[PDB]
Amino acid sequence: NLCPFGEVFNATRFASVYAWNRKRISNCVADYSVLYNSASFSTFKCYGVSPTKLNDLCFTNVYADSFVIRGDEVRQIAPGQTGKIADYNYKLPDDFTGCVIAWNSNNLDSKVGGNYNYLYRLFRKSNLKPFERDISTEIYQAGSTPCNGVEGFNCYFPLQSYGFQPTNGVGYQPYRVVVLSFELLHAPATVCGPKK
Amino acid sequence: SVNQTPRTATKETGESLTINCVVTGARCGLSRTSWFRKNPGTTDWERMSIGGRYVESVNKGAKSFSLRIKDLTVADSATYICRAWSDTSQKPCHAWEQKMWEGHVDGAGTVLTVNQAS
Ligand SMILES: *[C@@H]1O[C@H](CO[C@@H]2O[C@@H](C)[C@@H](O)[C@@H](O)[C@@H]2O)[C@@H](O[C@@H]2O[C@H](CO)[C@@H](O)[C@H](O)[C@H]2NC(C)=O)[C@H](O)[C@H]1NC(C)=O
């Protein structure tokens, strides 16, 4: 019974990073060697686990979080990082155990004249906790004067569009990102590699 | 991550290009390297075979590596990518509390333009 990684990596639509999608993966066999040996992923970074040993390990559950960001920001999807994305959109814990997998998606997610469907959060009153998700659109009070839901001086709408175009430089091109979290609880395992 | 330099380059026919890639945050040693070229408009990257005009050097201790392309031609105009692997097969590894990675990652690319001769 194979884990449905296809539905995650080959999903027709991906989420904005601020509204990142999560899929729980349970009760299945995960062959990671096909993913790890694919030439399609320009980032495949694992923390707390060796990717060459994944087919020999079991986990309680696996979580698959996915979204789009720009190339320059893939480095923020890592334990201990800061920046707009890590601070305000998608945060990994310091003790993260899992893998971050990214690929360039200019051919799918950019459009002549600009694709504006992907957004990111620019402002927040506090940094996200690990794996916290914020999809609110409250006006951000940057000063001492209350905003009352009106954009203005020191009062900012919190989301911005990426505007992906095919002629963007690589650092500005869209990248799809899948974060696999390998959860280990004091419970029976439900996700194992083929070697069990 | 991999810091790949230069990000862009223009060369005359007959010159050489050296690309340097420096690997940062690797939990273990550099366990494998590869080089790929992409022509604009194409879907797939082409793996480069080292040994002729492509010559590679690896500095295991610095976790860096480089490629030199000899005898440049207009046919060499393209984007070039280095790919670095790090995994537990390379013996000296850092602790996990250090938030360092195993796996593979690519440099951001070198856009090479080679001008015609004469
Ligand atoms: C994500 O999809 C790729 C390729 O999808 C192919 O094209 C689609 C239109 C659809 O028809 C798929 O069924 C096709 O496979 C998967 O890569 C393929 O894997 C099979 C497995 O043996 C292989 O035979 C094909 O040659 C591969 N094709 C390519 C282009 O690489 C890939 O496995 C999918 N990812 C996940 C996580 O399932």
Author numbering:
A (entry chain A): 334 to 529
B (entry chain C): 21 to 138
Can you quote the paper on this entry?
VNARs are the smallest (~11 kDa) naturally occurring independent heavy chain-only binding domains in the vertebrate kingdom.
VNAR-3B4 binds distal to the ACE2 binding interface with no direct interaction with the residues involved in ACE2 recognition. Alignment of the 3B4 crystal structure with an available cryo-EM structure of the full spike protein bound to the host receptor ACE2 shows that the framework of 3B4 likely clashes with ACE2 when the RBD is in the “up” conformation. This suggests that the mode of neutralization for 3B4 is through steric occlusion rather than direct competition with the ACE2 binding site. We also found that VNAR-3B4 bound the RBD solely via its CDR3, the canonical VNAR paratope. For VNAR-3B4, its interaction was dependent on only 5 residues in the CDR3 region of the VNAR and 7 total residues in the spike RBD. Residues Glu122, His124, Asp126 of CDR3 form an anti-parallel β-sheet with residues Ser375, Phe377, and Cys379 in the β2-strand of the RBD. The extensive hydrogen bond (h-bond) pairing of these backbone residues likely accounts for much of the affinity of the interaction, and because it is not dependent on sidechain participation, it makes this part of the interaction primarily residue independent. In addition to the backbone-backbone interactions above, there is also an elaborate h-bond network formed between the terminal amines of Arg103 of 3B4 with the backbone carbonyls of Ala372 and Phe374 that is supported by a side-on intramolecular interaction between Asp126 and Arg103 of 3B4.
